[PDB]
Ligand binder design. Structure first.
Ligand SMILES: Nc1ncnc2c1ncn2[C@@H]1O[C@H](COP(=O)(O)OP(=O)(O)O)[C@@H](O)[C@H]1O
Ligand SMILES: [Mg+2]
Lengths: 50, 48, 48, 125, 121, 100
């Protein structure tokens, strides 16, 4: 499946249904710009644990 | 009952600033102190 | 002084509530007078 | 957001740590939003005729808080008729990029009329 | 969709207050701060419309606690009836939800700041 | 002899403390655990976990997808005429530049 949706005034093309994919992506939102960057590096640290 | 009820309610809330600061300066958990006192008072203890 | 700052903090939100300041000011005078009536009740006498 | 901060500032004075206050507000927010979902009404079961009217009830709300509200019945049709031409009538998507928007400085606001095409700002050869 | 204009807010508010009562300790006071924070929106609409916030807030809290119908809010245009079924006002659920989510998620970041260094330009 | 899926959720819960996530950790811990499990165990790479700083929206409205997004690019006239939804499209990549 494939679908383009304006996630927030930004048009982004999303591939869907890829069980054979050896990669991943994350679209983190935020009230402000530092909420996005803070939650970005937070999950980067969470990924670093696993 | 009336418009002055909230004024008298906030007057009672602001009057409890002294024992909140004693628990803050002493390192104790203030809310605990204020609520406990408020109640030990409901059991008829005028001084606590 | 700390009670004055607490009452002004109590009067800060009441200004946004939409009540006149004179009604708020006169309410504390009546509440303060009633507070003295409470103090005379629980006033424990002492001898010289 | 400022209302949460104003109520939180007094909580800190009473003695509470900021993080507890945050956790609390968050929990409360969840309760509230949820409870709102419980008492929420859905308008998808109605047909397209009644659903056409519901767009005017919401379009007049947002236009009512602006200077455009001198004729809210007239200009709300402009905002609704533009979406009728892009909706698919089943698993509908807005396709917002097709809807263009251009305004010319001239005349009065009452002379604004919706068109179906493209507005060009240039002359013939 | 939902029905805003203080209605939503008043509803949410009484909900929170009941739940707050079902909660004891540092948490209850909080829940109460979240309840009073939601009340600032319809009080702001009452302040801008000139109506009394005392009668407006007391009427919504007393009425919404009695009746279960949750589409009554602050009438700002001065109509005689506060029921919003007849006034033709509708708002989306995704729009009113984001007011609470982006607010409560920002204020967590605002409260965590302790050290504040500002390099002068 | 415990399960392997619950191991990553258990250790990632400690990482989400002292942050803005600790109350919303019930939903986002599943994102990073399922994200890293898609990677190959032998070759775990740090550049395949790029996160785009997209504005707008609440953090709980995010969604985890095994695919990848890119952000629309320059788009010369031609855009918004093709179908923006396909059933089973074939992806092609070209260091090829196709211009006159
Ligand atoms: N005619 C009306 N009757 C009742 N409530 C209204 C009316 N018009 C607007 N409101 C309320 O006032 C609020 C104003 O929102 P608005 O100011 O348009 O958005 P923003 O605050 O983002 O500019 C709306 O959420 C709505 O609930
Ligand atoms: Mg608006």
């Amino acid at each position: 499946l494939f679908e383009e949706m304006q996630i927030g005034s930004e048009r982004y093309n999303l591939f869907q249904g890829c069980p054979q994919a050896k990669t991943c992506t994350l679209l983190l939102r935020g009230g402000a710009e530092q909420v996005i960057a803070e939650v970005e590096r937070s999950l980067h640290d969470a990924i670093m644990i696993v | 009952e009336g418009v002055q009820a909230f004024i008298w309610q906030e007057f009672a809330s602001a009057l409890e600033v002294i024992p909140t600061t004693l628990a803050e300066n002493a390192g104790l958990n203030s809310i605990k102190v204020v609520t406990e006192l408020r109640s030990k008072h409901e059991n008829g203890e005028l001084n606590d | 002084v700390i009670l004055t700052g607490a009452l002004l903090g109590a009067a800060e939100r009441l200004l946004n509530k939409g009540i006149h300041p004179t009604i708020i000011a006169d309410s504390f005078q009546s509440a303060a007078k009633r507070s003295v009536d409470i103090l005379l009740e629980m006033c424990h006498k002492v001898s010289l | 957001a400022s209302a949460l901060l104003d109520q939180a500032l007094e909580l800190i004075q009473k003695g509470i740590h900021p993080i507890k206050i945050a956790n609390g507000f968050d929990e409360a927010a969840k309760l509230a939003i949820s409870k709102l979902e419980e008492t929420c009404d859905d308008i998808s079961a109605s047909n397209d005729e009644l659903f056409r009217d519901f767009l005017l009830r919401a379009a007049k709300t947002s236009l009512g808080s602006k200077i455009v509200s001198k004729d809210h019945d007239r200009f709300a049709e402009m905002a609704v008729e533009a979406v009728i031409n892009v909706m698919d009538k089943d698993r509908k998507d807005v396709d917002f990029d097709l809807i263009k928007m251009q305004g010319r400085v001239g005349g009065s606001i009452s002379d604004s009329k919706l068109i179906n095409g493209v507005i060009l700002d240039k002359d013939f050869s | 969709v939902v029905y805003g204009g203080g209605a939503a807010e008043v509803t949410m508010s009484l909900a929170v207050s009941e739940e707050a009562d079902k909660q004891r300790g540092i948490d209850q006071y909080a829940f109460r701060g979240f309840a009073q924070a939601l009340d600032t929106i319809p009080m702001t609409l009452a302040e801008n419309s000139g109506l009394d916030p005392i009668g407006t807030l007391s009427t919504l809290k007393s009425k919404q606690l009695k009746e279960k119908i949750s589409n009554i809010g602050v009438d700002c245009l001065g109509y005689g009836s506060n029921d919003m079924k007849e006034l033709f006002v509708v708002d989306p659920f995704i729009g009113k939800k984001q007011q609470i989510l982006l607010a409560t998620q920002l204020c967590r970041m605002i409260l965590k700041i302790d050290n504040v260094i500002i390099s002068g330009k | 002899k415990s399960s392997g899926r619950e191991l990553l959720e258990r250790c990632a819960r400690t990482a989400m403390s002292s942050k803005l996530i600790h109350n919303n950790a019930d939903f986002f811990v599943k994102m990073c655990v399922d994200a890293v499990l898609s990677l190959d165990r032998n070759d775990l790479d740090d550049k395949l976990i790029g996160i785009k700083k997209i504005p707008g929206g609440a953090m709980e409205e995010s969604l985890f997808i095994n695919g990848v997004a890119f952000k629309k690019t320059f788009s010369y006239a031609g855009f918004e005429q093709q179908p923006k939804k396909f059933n089973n499209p074939k992806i092609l990549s070209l260091n090829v530049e196709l211009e006159l």
